[PDB]
Structure formats: structure tokens, C-alpha cells
């Protein structure tokens, strides 16, 4: 009764992309600024230590910081230097080799989203890339999901897997008639892309 997916939709930030490695300090300065902090100097802190350092600085306000941070990245005109999460390329490549159509649905600005995807040489994997400004609404509306599916010519169903980290991703998937898979930390959930790849390979074979 469980079938291989007819399409796989991915979110970008905090699903495919790890936003905690190569944090742009300028962006986090603005967040800390908005949050009232002064006079935080991150300039001498090694990039790899920045996240643990910020976690201890922010304490209870850490979750709020991550919200502001993602919000800022979505609207940015600046280029990212982020790395993909572990196993992401292996999964994309497995799906491509098996001829399973893929798309991205993100609340990042569509134009900058497409530029970042092309900067990482990943455009060829995706038959539709939908960001904010590409439709009349954003997630958790189903509209951006339905837009990707219109553009890849696949009907919405529970064989369309929407891999996403957020509640808005899950809700958009459900409202669109598609199957949410929660990535990260009633619904299929996986902590990494190696396990998701094994699961999909097991469904295919």
C-alpha cells in the first residue's frame, strides 16, 4: 500500500541547505540588532564555533533568533555560502537516476533562490523551482506546492512527497493533498537524507 513517489518536492533552507555552516555574520548582526543586543563581537569567533556561541548567548531567545534569521535569509539580496546538508546530493542524484521528478518549494525570494541553486550547480535536478513572488501566496498556503506540480505535470496525491523541516511545509503539503515527510528535528519523519534515500530506494525496489 506504500508506493514509490511520483515526485519529490524539497524545501531549501533547513532541509536541503544547512544554514548554520558558514553563517554570514552581517546577517546575524542584524538579527541581534533587531533583538536589542549590543555590543556583540563575532568577528574573532571561528565560523564553526559561531552557532554554539550564539546558542549560549541567546539562551531562551535562541528559537526567536532562528526565526528572524530564516526570515532575513528569505528576503536577502546577498549571496549565500551555505553547504548542503549531509546526504542531500546523493539523494538528489538517486532520484534523478531513477527518473523521479523533483521540485523545490521555498519561501525564499524566487529569483535569489534560483540563483543560489544554480550557483551550487543543482538546477539540472529540478523540474520546477518555486519561491516567494512566484505565486500569489507563500507556505503554509498550498498554492506554491500546487504551482510546482502544475509546472512538472504531476497530479497532487499521497505519492507526491514533500520533504520539509517546518510546520508550514507540513501544512502546505497536507492542504495540497500531498504527503509530508518531516526532515530534521502522525507524520513520516527522518533525521537525515541517508535514511530518506534508503527509504525511497526500498520503495522503488
From TrEMBL:
GO terms for biological process: DNA repair. It is an enzyme of class 3 (hydrolase). Keywords: Hydrolase. It holds the Pfam family HAD_2. It catalyses: 2-phosphoglycolate + H2O = glycolate + phosphate. Its EC number is 3.1.3.18. One of its GO terms (molecular function) is phosphoglycolate phosphatase activity. The keyword Cell membrane does not apply. Pathway: Organic acid metabolism; glycolate biosynthesis; glycolate from 2-phosphoglycolate: step 1/1. Belongs to the HAD-like hydrolase superfamily. CbbY/CbbZ/Gph/YieH family. This is phosphoglycolate phosphatase. It comes from Ehrlichia chaffeensis (strain ATCC CRL-10679 / Arkansas).
Amino acid at each position: 500500500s506504500m508506493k514509490q513517489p511520483t515526485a519529490v518536492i524539497f524545501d531549501w533552507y533547513n532541509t536541503l541547505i544547512d544554514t548554520s555552516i558558514n553563517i554570514d555574520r552581517t546577517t546575524f548582526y542584524q538579527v541581534l540588532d533587531q533583538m536589542g543586543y549590543k555590543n556583540i563581537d563575532l568577528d574573532s569567533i571561528p565560523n564553526s564555533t559561531i552557532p554554539k556561541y550564539l546558542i549560549t548567548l541567546l539562551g531562551k531567545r535562541w528559537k526567536e533568533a532562528t526565526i528572524l534569521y530564516e526570515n532575513s535569509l528569505e528576503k536577502s539580496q546577498k549571496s549565500d555560502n551555505f553547504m548542503l546538508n549531509d546526504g542531500a546530493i546523493e539523494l538528489l542524484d538517486t532520484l534523478k537516476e531513477n527518473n523521479i521528478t523533483m521540485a523545490i518549494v521555498s519561501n525564499k525570494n524566487g529569483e535569489r533562490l534560483r540563483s543560489e541553486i544554480h550557483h551550487k550547480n543543482l538546477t539540472h535536478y529540478f523540474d520546477s523551482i518555486i519561491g516567494s513572488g512566484d505565486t500569489g501566496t507563500i507556505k503554509p498556503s498550498p498554492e506554491p506546492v500546487l504551482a510546482a506540480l502544475t509546472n512538472i505535470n504531476i497530479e497532487p496525491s499521497k505519492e507526491v512527497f514533500f520533504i520539509g523541516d517546518s510546520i508550514s511545509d507540513i501544512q502546505s503539503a497536507i492542504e495540497a493533498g500531498c504527503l509530508p515527510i518531516k526532515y530534521g528535528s502522525d507524520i513520516l519523519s527522518f533525521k537525515n537524507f541517508y535514511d530518506i534515500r534508503n527509504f525511497i530506494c526500498q520503495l522503488i525496489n
